[PDB]
Amino acid sequence: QQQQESARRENILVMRLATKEQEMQECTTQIQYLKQVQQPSVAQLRSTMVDPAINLFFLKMKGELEQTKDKLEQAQNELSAWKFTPDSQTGKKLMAKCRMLIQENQELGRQLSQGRIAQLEAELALQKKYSEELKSSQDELNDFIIQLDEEVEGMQSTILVLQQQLKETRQQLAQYQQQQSQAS
Amino acid sequence: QQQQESARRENILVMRLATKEQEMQECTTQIQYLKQVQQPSVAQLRSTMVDPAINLFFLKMKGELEQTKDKLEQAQNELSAWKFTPDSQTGKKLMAKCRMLIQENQELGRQLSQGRIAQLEAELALQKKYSEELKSSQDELNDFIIQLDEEVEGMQSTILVLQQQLKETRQQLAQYQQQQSQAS
Amino acid sequence: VPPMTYDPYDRELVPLLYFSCPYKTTFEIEISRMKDQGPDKENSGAIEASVKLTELLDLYREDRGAKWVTALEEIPSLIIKGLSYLQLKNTKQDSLGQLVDWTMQALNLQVALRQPIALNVRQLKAGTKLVSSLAECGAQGVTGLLQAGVISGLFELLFADHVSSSLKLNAFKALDSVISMTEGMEAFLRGRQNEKSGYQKLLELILLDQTVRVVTAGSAILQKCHFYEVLSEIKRLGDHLAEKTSSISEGEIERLINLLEEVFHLMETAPHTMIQQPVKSFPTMARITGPPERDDPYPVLFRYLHSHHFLELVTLLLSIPVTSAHPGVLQATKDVLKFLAQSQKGLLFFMSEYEATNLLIRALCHFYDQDEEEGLQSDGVIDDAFALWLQDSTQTLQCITELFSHFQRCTASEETDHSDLLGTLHNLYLITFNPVGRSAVGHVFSLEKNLQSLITLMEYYSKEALGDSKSKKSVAYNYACILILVVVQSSSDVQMLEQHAASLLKLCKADENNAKLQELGKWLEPLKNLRFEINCIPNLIEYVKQNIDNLMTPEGVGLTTALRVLCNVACPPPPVEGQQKDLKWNLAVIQLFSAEGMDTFIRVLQKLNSILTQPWRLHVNMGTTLHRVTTISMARCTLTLLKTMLTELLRGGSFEFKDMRVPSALVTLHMLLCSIPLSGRLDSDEQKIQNDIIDILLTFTQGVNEKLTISEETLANNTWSLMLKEVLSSILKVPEGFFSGLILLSELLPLPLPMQTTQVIEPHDISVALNTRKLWSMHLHVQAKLLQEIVRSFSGTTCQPIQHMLRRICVQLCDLASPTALLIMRTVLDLIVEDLQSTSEDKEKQYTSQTTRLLALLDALASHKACKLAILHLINGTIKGDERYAEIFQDLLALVRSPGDSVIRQQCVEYVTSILQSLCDQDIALILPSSSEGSISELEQLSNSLPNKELMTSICDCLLATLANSESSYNCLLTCVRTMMFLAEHDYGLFHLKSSLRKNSSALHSLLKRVVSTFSKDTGELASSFLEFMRQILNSDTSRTMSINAAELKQLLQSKEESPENLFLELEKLVLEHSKDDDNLDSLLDSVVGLKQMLESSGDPLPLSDQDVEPVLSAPESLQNLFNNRTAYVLASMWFTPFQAEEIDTDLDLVKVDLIELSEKCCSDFDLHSELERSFLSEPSSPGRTKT
């Protein structure tokens, strides 16, 4: 039928136009985000601090100052190193710093060695084993809880049966005590 | 069921789609324009508007850079003044050793708190926390089981007292029945 | 023909078509289905059970033996089918009545006492199961039970002596089933006459000694009774408010807000405190025993809400003029509505009660009109989108029901009417245009197997063709593809994908040449053969670390899904009050750490802040909402993963964590995401990110005890000091981060004391808060050279947000302890003195605008309790090297004594006089003034609130000089008369003021001449303040032992004998000031006429009293003791937002003309910047993975 395919074509155009309205929404919200109503304060902040030229210049200046400072301190300690000599305060301090760094490097080496990693792995395995031991204990505890509830239910049932029998005996005794007294 | 109305609807739909698409073109040109019009140049970088704080930072960094440069040149000429001596050479060698030690000590210290032997310690601590939480929960469940067991003991005592009452009443009833059955 | 112009509120709700009502029980659902559907395939399945039921109640009509007990255990399985079928067939023997008779016979203790050995307790539990199965049977069944007295029959099991606990717990489960229905709940709360109600019996039962699980069940029933009582009280309050105003009290509105908040907090903790836990499940601290299944209490909470008409009530409240005006009613109501709309059950509650829901939506929309009318929605009043979100959520669930009910009608044929299907899909697609509507569509399709409505939709049209255009484009297929793509993209909750990943991947694979299906398949890369448990954490982490390079490249878009899933299966939801912790969340974190998870989340954060860093600078903030949503979801999932890996690791026991890649990356991600919101306020998704950042950084503070702080060589290497170093060094790193670091440090640092709390607090919390502040001060005093640089750098700036946040930091950071406040205040005062001696060396003092900005900073700080005392304990001159501060304060006082004609000095003198006002303000102190007990005596309090006697004499002389000066401004005069008012409130300052007037006897005369010579309708404030102070010197002769009489004051008012002339001129100037605009004119008139009456009531010439007892203050307590003894809690503009409209940057910020290009050759050489910035706008201009 000519109407069915015509309606399908209309559906095609409506689908395309719906996607077009989606892109309208995206572009218009991007416009509203770019040209948003903004305070003077945020514009000042983004034009004075977040200014790309100022940021790049500040980063370059900070980097250059850091490099110059590190080179200066290197040169100062190094000229102290030509001033290194035994039995002098500079010499004693410098050699003591070197030995302290030897000791610290040895400590970091023993704290990073494969032996210490294996020790920590063994401790982790022991902790895991303790965890499955606790879980097995928890399973046993659950079984104990189940058996305790079953015992409680059985005890209540036999309590009720005992109450039944005790009643029946009590009324039988009372009725036969009233009954047998008439023959005295 | 007419086809002329369907054809007219299709034509108006495609016209609306074309209008929406020319709005696509205009809006996307506006998006492309707004997103990249911030052209810097040289004439407006000779007269950059900076905040007083930013200008003060630039002045402070420039001054500190100037003193660091001049004292670094002084350090270099002082290095050049000194001549090679065995103490100076051993000091230079040991200072190079010290710098290498500091570098590799920082590297080892950032491997220790970021590498595998930090994830291992985190795993160990978390496993200990999980095991202690599970053990505390099991300890509380043990007190709950103690409550259930004391309930069991109470019901057992009730069973015993009801059984003794039943026994005494039953024997009393039996003796009374075979007592007054003969005296009637 | 579906129209493209979408009005979000042109569609209303209609009755539920596919999903059943959430509050309807199984029996009511079955009976409605069998009433409207009629005969069906399962009608035979109902009849074989209905015949068994009707034969089963007939074969046992008088027998109560073992076989009867066995039948009692088979009745519950036959209830839902047989009873409904009999009720529909109009049974003439009252099957429900016979079932209730069986239930009550079984539940009695005197019928159990006639049974065999081991089936009497079995009879009792069968009876309680029948109670639970007949209470979930509708109003008919519940009323049939209650008329037989099931509450009084259930409370015979509970009160029975020597009965089991697993039987009393089953009886609690049956009582909860009975009270779940509203009729049973009413019969429980308000019991029969001449009998105790069920509530009283339950309370008496709880007061006994019983097993922990039994009392837990009792508390669970009581917590549901409390919820029902709160709902009924809300109903009564709403009725009062809707009947009084329709023809009002504030208490009945504050209580209503509190009750709505209680309803919300009871629905949060409903699945933990309102449910009956299983018989084998104990209330341990962490769930270790019992079945893992727990029935949800929302199907009965919604019955309570509907029986009380909660939606109609909130509609009334949101439409009553007095209640609509309150901003707390709306927030409290919308919290409850948001919680309801979060779930599938709650959203079906909204849709089932559609008549009330439509009016609720309309009322919320009219609030969006009311906020538009007020115009305050820009700030303060949040830009709420809840009305549109709820409308879109209910509408997309309505469309989901329409989709589902369109496939039920095709279980015996094939689809032929697709106009309705395409209309539904189109009206659902246009919901996905707004970000709010897109979020709603992504949310609703992720709830309880809703995405199947579209998965089956494409599975049906995978048979007509491949899905693309061969003979027809299959428009429904394209709509389904787009809708599944947008829900997968926008839904942060990924529980749907757990069960739909296989189907979605099959759909993507079966049609390889679709533009949307390829992207959907790329969105589901991590979910190929994945089980969504804690054991697949290594797989997800391996996926995230394998393609971390393609972070936001549209090829590695599935990494967002991998992080959403990994945050869904390894991050617990925010814990609520009463919830017992599941132990699988600890195993999730252990697995998240076993596989490298700290490395592959820090790396995700580093890549994210390395990609976002370039567009952020160039004012490109992820324009497209798809990319915005993807980036926000990625950041939030990574932050949640890091938080749950750090909160569960850095808590309780001290564990060293010196990674320092988390804070150094979070200080940058905060810059890129939460630093400069262009809307002036952080939205709903960039505030969760900021809160996550704050929590992760604060997790470096927890776990630190008072043993790592004993030694300074261990204090500086702590896991807290290192975090503080990484946060403080990242502030002065880049000027773009200047504001970000400040706004981050303002959240890290603790709030200023005292806390504003509505209730009294135990001293333990006061002690822990003071200890936290002391620890913060200790960990910040090791970064003294960084705080000094922060406060020396941003001081003098003209960027209003940065200056505001700097003076907020210097308020938070001086409220911690004495050292960290003295540090900042020494820095500020030394900076002021070095600025004043920077250009005035060997010369008289010269003031620039840097000085006035610096003084503005000092004054903004000096108006606070701790900073004022830090100033004071430096400017006294106690020997610690503090002579410079005393000299500079004397210099400021000399400045105020002689301001000059310069326009910048006139702007500094107002700041200095405001500083003087703040210092002399008694109310601004650590020890708040209080004559009663709880604080030191007032005379002993003025020694920690006011300067010493020499400084007080100097300040008094300065105030008199600036009052007598004819060049002084108006704001400075107002501030000085306020300061005189402050000093006139106590004998000490008033004595110093009085002693100052003898060396300057023309000060009052000069001030009065100044105020009467230039009096107008706007300068009347100064006159009113002067008259108030004028009375404050005379309000004590009617009190203060130190004062003056009228005679000496009148003679002090004159240097030439013309004081009556000035007083008269002031009197008749009020008449010509039209004396009618405001009551301030009348107040000033009465004050001036009273003073005029006192003028002629005593002889004027009488010199001021010379010798009298001098009030001497006590020695000033050390600042460390004042901070320790400070009032930590009290019973109860700068903090609302940093982007102030205008405080300093009014129109002239003194931007300095900086010559960057020529300032480059002097320093290290560097090429022209212009090409550098222009190279950044070509490739990384569009959102995506940027080259830099």
Numbering used by the authors:
A (entry chain C), B (entry chain D): 64 to 247
C (entry chain A): 333 to 579, 619 to 1409, 1428 to 1521, 1530 to 1585
What does the paper say about this structure?
After extensive trials of expression and purification, we obtained four complexes containing different MACOM components: HWVZ (containing HAKAI, WTAP, VIRMA, and ZC3H13 (1106–1668)), HWV (containing HAKAI, WTAP, and VIRMA), WVZ (containing WTAP, VIRMA, and ZC3H13 (1106–1668)), and WV (containing WTAP and VIRMA). To understand the structural basis of the MACOM function, we determined the 3.0-Å resolution structures of the HWVZ and HWV complexes using single-particle cryo-EM analysis. Notably, the overall structure of the HWV complex lacking the ZC3H13 component is similar to that of the HWVZ complex based on superimposition aligned by WTAP, although the horse body is slightly stretched out upon ZC3H13 binding. Moreover, the side chain of R109 from L1’ and the indole ring of W987 from the Neck domain form cation–π interactions in addition to the hydrogen bond between the side chain of R109 and the main chain of W987. These specific interactions allow WTAP and VIRMA to form the MACOM core, and most of the interactions remain in the structure of the HWV complex when ZC3H13 is removed. In contrast, removing ZC3H13 has a dramatic effect, which reduces the binding affinities of HWV and WV complexes to Kd = 562.7 ± 76.6 nM and 826.3 ± 336.0 nM, respectively. Specifically, removing ZC3H13 dramatically reduces substrate binding and methyltransferase activity, suggesting that ZC3H13 is a key component of MACOM for substrate binding and m6A writer activity.
Deposition of m6A onto RNAs is achieved by the m6A methyltransferase complex (m6A writer), a large holocomplex of ~1000 kDa in size that contains methyltransferase-like 3 and 14 (METTL3/14), Wilms’ tumor 1-associated protein (WTAP), KIAA1429 (VIRMA), Zinc finger CCCH domain-containing protein 13 (ZC3H13), RNA binding motif protein 15/15 paralog (RBM15/15B), and E3 ubiquitin ligase CBLL1 (HAKAI). Here, we report the cryo-electron microscopy (cryo-EM) structures of MACOM at a 3.0-Å resolution, uncovering that WTAP and VIRMA form the core structure of MACOM and that ZC3H13 stretches the conformation by binding VIRMA. Our cryo-EM structure reveals that WTAP forms a homodimer, with each monomer consisting of four tandem helices (H1–H4/H1’–H4’ with coiled-coil interactions) and three linkers (L1–L3/L1’–L3’).
